[PDB]
Amino acid sequence: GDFLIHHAIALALHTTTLILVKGALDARGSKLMPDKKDFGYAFPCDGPGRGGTCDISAWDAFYLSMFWMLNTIG
């Protein structure tokens, strides 16, 4: 039982790290917003064009990793 939960805790540590690292490393730019750094840290989106850009900011990866942080400490 302790083996299984530690691997769940490992899953949640790597997944929270993933969202946060992806937020840090794509903060300056990505392929959707190559100029993402001109808009700041917390901006809503770049609009519905190019397929849709909801939660594209680096702040939004903080937002998404907060759910995974709560899940892991749970």
Partner 1 sequence: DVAGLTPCGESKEFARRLDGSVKKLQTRLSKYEAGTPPALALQKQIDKTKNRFDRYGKAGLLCGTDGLPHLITDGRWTHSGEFVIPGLLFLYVAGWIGWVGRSYVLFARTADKPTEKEIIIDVPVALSFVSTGFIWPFSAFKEFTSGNLIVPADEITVSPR
Residue ranges of the binding site: 45, 54
Q: Does 25 bind partner 1 (CB under 8 A)?
A: yes
Q: Does 30 bind partner 1 (CB under 8 A)?
A: yes
Residue of 27, 46, 45 lying closest to 37 (CA atoms): 27
User: Running DSSP on this structure, what letter comes out for residue 52?
Assistant: -
Residues 6+ apart with CB under 8 A from 64: 19, 23, 55
Query: What part of residues 32-71 is at the interface with partner 1 (CB under 8 A)?
Result: 34
Q: Does 28 bind partner 1 (CB under 8 A)?
A: yes
Binding site for partner 1 (CB under 8 A): 25-26, 28-31, 34
